[PDB]
Amino acid sequence: ETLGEKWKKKLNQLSRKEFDLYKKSGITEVDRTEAKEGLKRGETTHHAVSRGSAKLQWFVERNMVIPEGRVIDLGCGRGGWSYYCAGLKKVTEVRGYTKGGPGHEEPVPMSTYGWNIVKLMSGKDVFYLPPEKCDTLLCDIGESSPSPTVEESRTIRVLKMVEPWLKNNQFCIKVLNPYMPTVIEHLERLQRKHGGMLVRNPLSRNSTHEMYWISNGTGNIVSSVNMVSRLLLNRFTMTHRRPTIEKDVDLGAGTR
Ligand SMILES: C[S@@+](CC[C@H](N)C(=O)[O-])C[C@H]1O[C@@H](n2cnc3c(N)ncnc32)[C@H](O)[C@@H]1O
Ligand SMILES: Cc1ccc(C(=O)O)c(N)c1
């Protein structure tokens, strides 16, 4: 049994009260107060539509993924990754796809900088989409489940679906459950072919073991995964550490 499996079993033993105290203990988060208030009023400039804009920004500002040219955003939801990419100097077009409908996020129309080069298409299940040529491939799909075998299936399905979209392009792909041995096998194969590395984002909650496969990096996947399992396991030991608060992103206004 992996350390990740021990983490998941302990997470599943927590009461709701314990879970709620654990999930943000020692993580980093952006202060969404201002954006939430603006979005409730229907403001269409400056605000990021979700926490996702700051989450992808964390990787971009560290050069782990450097969006450029035609960006595909799989599982765009509200559009946080798409609207953030729309303002980046090297980006020329953003196409977001998301399922939408009951139980899923609809794209939120915005007028943040570069909105005119964004097209968000809901009602699209990416598992039935044929691949398109793109210079940057983004994917933020992977629904958590109390069952790690359900998560294992969901993760492998994402890894198999994204591969045909990868053609010597920039990429950033969520890996929901990176600790199951079958997932590690796929990730190692994918890294041998497409390069890159798996990275834990500090803005992720402790309630998910998600890591992101980014194109610009190297390293040992197994070591990085076990480091996260040990980090998350140790976060059950101590009393709640309030999250480290950071400023949210200002996505500005205007066309390009
Ligand atoms: C973690 S959210 C994406 C958040 C987004 N990156 C942002 O910045 O706002 C993952 C999204 O994938 C969508 N999704 C899940 N399964 C999908 C599928 N089969 N096809 C398309 N979208 C899917 C979910 O509805 C959800 O909105
Ligand atoms: C643009 C669009 C098209 C179809 C659906 C749907 O879920 O049936 C949807 N949620 C959004």
Distance from the CA of 140 to the center of ligand 1, in angstroms?
6
Please list, in sequence order, all residues whose beta carbon lies within 8 angstroms of the beta carbon of residue 73, skipping any fewer than 6 positions away: 79, 81, 82, 85, 94, 95, 96, 97, 138, 139, 140
Instruction: Report CA-CA distances (Å) from 204 to 8, 25, 56, 58, 83.
Output: 16, 11, 11, 11, 20
The rounded distance, in Å, linking the Cα atoms of 148 and 187 is 17
The rounded distance, in Å, linking the Cα atoms of 199 and 255 is 33
- Any alpha helices (H) in 80-216, and if so which ranges? 80-85, 148-162, 181-194
Q: Which residue has the tokens 């700051």?
A: 54
The CATH number of 1-256 is 3.40.50.150
Q: Is 68 a catalytic residue?
A: no
- The one-letter code for the residue type at 178 is P
Q: Is 210 a catalytic residue?
A: yes
Was 125 annotated as part of a binding site? Answer: yes
Query: Minimum-distance ligand to the CA of 120?
Result: 2
Instruction: Report CA-CA distances (Å) from 76 to 98, 118, 179, 227.
Output: 5, 11, 25, 29
Helix 181-194 with 148-162: angle, nearest 10 deg: 20
The rounded distance, in Å, linking the Cα atoms of 71 and 65 is 12
Burial 195-217 (b: 16+ CB within 10 A, else e): bbbbbbbebbebbbbbbbbbbbb
- The preferred substitution site among 32, 140, 155 for testing ligand 1, maximizing ligand atoms within 8 Å of CB, is 140
Ligand 2 pocket, residues with Cβ under 6 angstroms: 100-101, 122-123
Q: Is 174 a catalytic residue?
A: yes
Closest atom, ligand 2, to C-alpha of 104: 10
Resolution (A): 1.5
Q: From the candidates 73, 105, 135, 140, which is the catalytic residue?
A: 140
